[PDB]
């Protein structure tokens with residue numbers, strides 16, 4: 636399968652995907668990396684791996700549909716089969732999500748359905764959980780609410796900050812996101828017609 640990764644930042648998740656798709660027997664190759672933000676490290680990581688990049692600045696579009704269409708143009712240009720959102724921070728429009736249904740994955744730093752949204756670690760700390768984790772899910776229109784592929788629990792330590800908790804959870808993310816990508820790229824895991832995840 637030909638894979639695009641969308642990013643908005645550091646790209647540590649991207650890096651783990653690059654590394655895993657180049658291990659032997661991979662069913663995926665990363666063919667394009669797209670950022671909505673210039674000068675982010677994830678772009679350097681892609682370029683250092685010999686993977687083309689684009690910057691599509693979301694602020695230059697009137698609305699989300701037009702921005703998403705510009706993304707979609709590039710995904711077509713690269714004959715992309717599967718899209719991975721790896722620290723991508725733009726909510727995608729209905730029609731984009733519908734088009735990519737069953738073929739777009741996201742990594743989220745909590746055990747969904749808890750702590751939906753972009754500040755999951757701040758929520759986990761306020762709430763006082765001792766166990767949090769991360770989730771790979773198919774992307775649905777409702778944010779952080781698509782069908783769950785894999786999850787991994789990560790302990791919260793007394794005295795954690797957002798930084799330390801974030802780092803511990805990233806280590807688990809770098810395990811489950813490549814694993815989930817491989818599952819979907821091999822056709823082992825599919826989104827079924829009934830809208831539920833199917834293991835073949």
Ligand SMILES: NC1NC(=O)C(CCC[C@H](c2ccc(C(=O)N[C@@H](CCC(=O)O)C(=O)O)cc2)C(O)(O)C(F)(F)F)C(N)N1
Nearest residue numbers: 724725726727741743744752753774775776777778779780
């Ligand atoms: N329709 C749709 N459904 C999805 O499930 C997507 C996957 C969501 C990724 C999650 C997420 C949750 C909220 C946002 C968000 O509010 N973005 C704002 C911009 C926020 C900002 O600049 O800080 C904005 O205006 O877009 C961005 C990302 C995430 O919480 O899991 C995390 F971790 F990535 F942040 C998606 N892109 N589109």
